[PDB]
Design a binder for this molecule. Structure first.
Ligand SMILES: Cc1ncc(COP(=O)(O)O)c(/C=N/N[C@H](CCCCN)C(=O)O)c1O
Ligand SMILES: Cc1ncc(COP(=O)(O)O)c(/C=N/N[C@H](CCCCN)C(=O)O)c1O
Ligand SMILES: Cc1ncc(COP(=O)(O)O)c(/C=N/N[C@H](CCCCN)C(=O)O)c1O
Lengths: 710, 710, 237
């Protein structure tokens, strides 16, 4: 934050000489001087380099509208205008609102002006920094000696060891000096909500449209556990999205609560759909309560918004129709809502208080914003017991929080403020839309197969595209209108292999092969389905990465059409089993995997298996408790009918839980067993594509076992 | 790790010129060349700089015993010997065991030798690095493009923002690039225990003398909860150290487990003593089970070893005598055991398998070793159900672990390997002992008051000093012999105010004032008691910090004797309340606090309050569940007698839980109430010394309230 | 107050190279480094140059009695001892009374030691400065814009005039920037005996063995008139 831009190269000594003296004086204050050639050059320089901390220009040459253009991108960016002919009568109120400091041309005045510019730079840094992060930076500047934990003592222990010195050099001195504990009392305490930490929370609460905000250092898994534990005492009933993360299952296995599951939809690709509106109706909930033993009217409800693939709910309807006092939205995938108007009414915090209800949002700051991993936010709108919620929060938060993660959470809040943050979010949205349009365009010019994007046909402007019943791009059957919206940030690319009606095509390219190819060429997809790939076009994706992705996809298509050897096209896959892939070509491998999927009819089997709910003999807490007591045995896959499952069965695809602890497979739920057996059979044919079923254990004979209650 | 030391100043061109050529060629490979003046200079240089990666010396001038001296400090540090007169007949087997590579003198041979030295440096780095950290570093060197979480995409989003650019510049590019998720499949999965992660675990298990090892990214709080949840099913009885961390209390509030509390001792200073051997006897436990309602024979037992003040147990006796199938040692404060012989038999992992028992150790790697905060280890010795334990582990571990914390854990394991790690631990122990001896010496030669050190009178050699019933330095009454030992690392300094018999002196200086003075002068103590101050002499403490501490203590004594103004001595304290501290001098403030402590008789009241156990109406789980249901009201301090506490009451001092959730104060436990009232009265007299009682809430009127069940 | 004396010419790399690095890091912080040839040279240099703000020496070569000799001339002058063989057991209470800060020899540790020495230099300057003078210097460092008397506004009016510019160059910028009035409320008021002014009086009273002290800006003529007028009412002898 030490780059100062000086405009103009005028030809009068009485201006150039003071500017050269000021250049020397600023360099004496550790500033880096850059010289844009014109106004447009300066604007581009500001737009591309966030470390530009100041602009110096001649007022005689440029009017104060240049400051308006500068403030359109960064309203806090200090501007220094040198006045020669204009006086105090040449400035208006609107101009006086801009962040301009006025200086004059004079020999020998460079030291004072350089000091003024230094003070202005410090003030700008102070203004844009959030409170807790600024306090942490100041503490690191202090350089105090610690005799407390962590114990590496600001990295000294690492510097005393060779391997530790490598670690120190990799992570740097500042990452070690900022690693502190509550023994440093000037920083306050995360658990006590005191000092800068306290202000941090309020800062966050104002940035994310929340009444109360809590910082979590063990991810949205821990955030979900905290919210669920405060909301649902032992013996209560909770509505749970079936498309819930495994953390909700862990919470259920932790606390004795009775679950009643919302039933979401899906398509042929295996993309999880939204919960139909009827499932939020009071009569449906009452019927499920009556049909569920030891179940009363639910006191908490958890909905996944959005889904992994980017399907957001109209949350106003849910907040109005869900007759539950506590509504929690697992928004791990959408922390950027409230920073763009396209998400209005599509998130838990949207709007104001709900009478007689409390609304929670759990957000993975580290997922779609800029924050270190495990950084999570809990946002509360409504009435809570602050003491009791603080107890539930302390039971899951460590007494030695990582200050880097907490500061990253606060800095993520800070990065969303002002014109710079608005431009960040809007630019990411526009980049994703441009990539989607380019994928469609390339598909049009392509002669033969090419990747498609799972989206509406004619996307034009920046918005969350609604999923209507008339259209068939989304693949959902009889969908509710004004219910589900597609997030433009989450870009799903489709590989060939499925038809418009949901059936399989004669040929197809499993998306896992494309994922491996991208990995070999330095591109990491977020996740891969049977014929879909998810790419996150977050604030961290630039034009370079999008163009590289396009080039890699085109190169894959060219290589596949040429039918190259798997040895050369996928070197890592060949290294997995050189004998099996010695002479195989990419087309033969892709067609073999597609033929396995088609002959076993994976899409229909997966859909049928996930549209029938296994019967709940006991809640997950009871099954886990009897598992901890040793009352469990390992049986084979085919013998699981009539057995109470002890663990969660989470297969890939589709990547969501199919069987919950305390659930039993019957003749009605036999599709679950045959889908699992199909997955086990398919995963044993190609050495680089194994069966991935959490909760199932592969034996030496290749058979798969599950753990069930005796 | 690019510093090469050349020990050579010969006066022959046929050696000098090839060495100069080698210097230029090594500099071309980005090596920093240093020139020690002699053998002793080279040895000191190696001892003081862990970034030295190679030694080049002339074999004619120096025999191979110099390599022996080098390997005494670093057995992997490559040595390059230039042979002129010696041949293959001049090397013995013992010399051949040393890591020495032989070269020859020749013009024009510098490039090949420099390449060989580069390969040797890379081999050295590879040899000392642990596997998972090496994989992380290699992945960062790859520089791939991510379309997955975290979403800052290696820090790109940070570089696109001004405040984010400040954050990026502070933490550095490598910290942000190493932040990844399981979408990068080559690094494996911590949750799945696959790939390099798996190797890391095995590596850790071999370094810490554990059968199995698990890495926790949410601290020893989460590690304790995982161990307890696996070991204690709902409805089971657990033996719990009363000197337990709040995490064990949180686990009891989470799971319906019935606790039976061990009773540790304490001294006049409030230092928590060890649990007497009688509490571990089968008859005592059986009697407690008979008296405790809804209690069976305990299936789990948790012991805090060591204590906060550094008291380790003879763990062999506990393992032999404690008739519990599951014994868990909360060793958050002692992760360096197994790395020094003085701790033999003083930790859970010491020795081998206990027949019919499982032993757990929970270590805060980030507390006394070199690791990032929240890094913890679970060490298991004995038979466990790996699948059930893995489920319990997943229930508390986030699906997006901080890879930096995981790598810091592995690097902490690697830092203990070899002669360098042995020298690190031994140097820390010897530094702590030298500081203790210096404190004793300064006390002996001081005229008047001086800081004391809680230790035996005649500490000479490096060992854990036993606490004998004959000596009275430790202040414990009728202690068992060969039971408790003092860890030399944990240095407790005593300020005047107490007497040798346990009563308080006429005058005294509370340790909080000394703590504030040290904070003002850049020294952070671990924690402060009424008259004691704890300092951690970890591997991160050097001679510089120890001498700085001594200087600061002498400065405090001088300033206090001069009776300076509080305005000048403690500027922050005066800034808290300028009107109250306007004319106060340090002696008056210290004497006022000491007079309050004496008049209220804090030591005797605290001892009595922690000597009587409050009666357990219900276990903490029941109280917390009924608190989550709104069945809790708020009463004042004087009205808690006969009420069931809803939350744990943790007073400071002594910093350990006094009242647990579900416990009720009676006439037998009225000293608890008197002690709490005394603390509330004492904390309202000086604006910088407030009452610190977790679970008690100060109101506007100044009175303190606690909440109980209605 | 930026002259640091470094005292040794040892013949070992593991000490010489860190000292050279510290020399570079101290020059980066605007310090002037001097190299006395021996102990007596250093003592004479300290005696003859009050602008010496620090002494760096090797603890192996010189015991802490050299710090005693230095403190005999200036008890607040910071000394920096580099410890190699001596440990915490080699220092006594009397030595611990001296204003010595201890460092170690290590490559790459120069920036931290330079920052520590800078903080020590600032503390030394603060300790020797009186309160009101310190406040005036700090205010001048703030560089505020005044719309109040004196009216030259920190010397701007002098810089706007040729003869005024000669006057300004002669008297210097700090003299004109420190010439302020009570409109700057943070400096307090001499007439009201408030703020740093009040502290100044107390400071003066302690230094001159007086119960009360008053500052006069019009000489002992005015001081005598004040004392006499308070002491001698009209009509007295
Ligand atoms: C809806 C929802 N709610 C909560 C959480 C827990 O949040 P976390 O602890 O991870 O911060 C997640 C986490 N999903 N990601 C993990 C894998 C890590 C990311 C790999 N690129 C998974 O797929 O299991 C979630 O999807
Ligand atoms: C016996 C025992 N067992 C487990 C834990 C949890 O380990 P953690 O989650 O913190 O890694 C702790 C934690 N003690 N330290 C914390 C914070 C200290 C910060 C200043 N140095 C506290 O005082 O409450 C413990 O003392
Ligand atoms: C006993 C006594 N009491 C008070 C004062 C007034 O003090 P002042 O206003 O000057 O600060 C003076 C002043 N004497 N100085 C002048 C000579 C000027 C300096 C020549 N080098 C004189 O002799 O006339 C004094 O001698």
């Amino acid at each position: 934050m030490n780059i100062i831009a000086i405009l103009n190269h005028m030809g009068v000594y009485f201006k150039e000489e003071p500017i050269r003296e000021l250049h020397k004086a600023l360099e004496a204050l550790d500033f880096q001087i850059v010289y844009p050639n014109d106004r447009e050059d300066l604007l581009k320089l500001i737009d591309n380099n966030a470390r530009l901390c100041g602009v110096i220009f001649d007022w005689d040459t440029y009017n104060l509208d240049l400051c308006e253009e500068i403030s359109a991108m960064n309203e806090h960016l200090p501007v220094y205008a040198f006045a020669n002919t204009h006086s105090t009568l040449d400035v208006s109120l609107n101009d006086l609102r801009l962040n301009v400091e006025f200086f004059e041309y004079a020999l020998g005045a460079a030291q004072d002006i350089a000091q003024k510019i230094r003070q202005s730079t410090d003030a700008y840094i102070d203004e844009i920094l959030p409170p807790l992060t600024k306090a942490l930076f100041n503490y690191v500047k202090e350089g105090k000696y610690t005799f407390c934990t962590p114990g590496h003592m600001g990295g000294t222990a690492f510097q005393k060891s060779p391997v530790g010195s490598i670690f120190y050099d990799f992570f740097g001195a500042n990452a070690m000096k900022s690693d502190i504990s509550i023994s440093v009392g000037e920083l306050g305490s995360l658990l006590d909500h005191s000092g800068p930490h306290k202000e941090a929370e309020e800062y966050i609460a104002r940035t994310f449209n929340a009444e109360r905000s809590y910082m979590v250092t063990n991810g949205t898994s821990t955030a979900n556990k905290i919210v669920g534990m405060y909301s649902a005492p032992a013996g209560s009933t909770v509505l749970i999205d079936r498309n819930c993360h495994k953390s909700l299952t862990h919470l259920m296995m932790m606390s004795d609560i009775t679950p009643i599951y919302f039933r979401p939809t899906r398509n042929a690709y295996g993309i999880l759909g939204g919960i139909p509106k009827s499932e939020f109706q009071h009569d449906t909930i009452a019927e499920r309560v009556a049909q569920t033993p030891n179940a009363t009217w639910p006191v908490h409800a958890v909905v996944t918004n959005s889904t992994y693939d980017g399907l957001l709910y109209n949350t106003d309807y849910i907040k109005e129709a869900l007759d539950v006092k506590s509504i929690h939205f697992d928004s791990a995938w959408v922390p950027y809502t409230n920073f763009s108007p396209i998400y209005k009414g599509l998130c838990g915090m949207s709007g104001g208080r709900v009478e007689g209800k409390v609304i929670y949002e759990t957000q993975s700051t580290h997922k779609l914003l800029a924050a270190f991993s495990q950084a999570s936010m809990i946002h509360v709108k409504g009435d809570i017991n602050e003491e009791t919620f603080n107890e539930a929060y302390m039971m899951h938060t460590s007494t030695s929080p990582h200050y880097g993660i907490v500061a990253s959470t606060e800095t993520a809040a800070a990065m969303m403020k002002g014109n710079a943050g608005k431009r960040l979010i809007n630019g990411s949205i526009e980049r994703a839309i441009r990539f989607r349009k380019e994928i469609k365009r390339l598909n049009s010019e392509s002669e033969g197969w090419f990747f498609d994007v799972w989206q509406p046909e004619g996307i034009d402007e920046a918005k969350c595209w609604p999923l209507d019943s008339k259209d068939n791009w989304h693949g959902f059957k009889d969908i509710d209108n004004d219910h589900m919206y597609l997030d433009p940030i989450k870009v799903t690319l489709l590989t060939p292999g499925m038809q418009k009606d949901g059936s399989m095509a004669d040929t197809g390219i499993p998306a896992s092969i494309v994922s491996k190819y991208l990995d070999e060429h330095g591109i990491i997809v977020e996740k891969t389905g049977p014929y879909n790939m998810l790419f996150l076009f977050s604030i961290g994706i630039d034009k370079t990465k999008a163009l590289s992705l396009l080039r890699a996809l085109t190169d894959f298509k060219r290589s596949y059409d040429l039918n190259l050897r798997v040895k050369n096209m996928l070197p890592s896959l060949y290294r997995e089993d050189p004998e099996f892939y010695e002479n195989m070509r990419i087309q033969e491998l892709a067609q073999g995997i597609h033929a396995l999927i088609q002959h076993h009819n994976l899409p229909d089997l997966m859909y049928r298996a996930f549209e029938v709910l296994p019967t709940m003999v006991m809640n997950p807490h009871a099954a886990f408790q009897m598992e901890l007591r040793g009352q469990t045995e390992e049986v084979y896959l085919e013998e699981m009918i009539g057995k109470v499952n002890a663990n969660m069965i989470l297969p890939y695809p589709p990547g969501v839980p199919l069987v919950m602890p305390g659930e039993m497979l019957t003749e009605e739920s036999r599709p679950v067993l045959e889908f699992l057996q199909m997955l086990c059979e398919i995963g044993a044919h190609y050495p680089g594509f194994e069966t991935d079923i959490h909760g199932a254990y592969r034996q030496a004979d290749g058979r798969y076992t599950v753990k069930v209650i005796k």
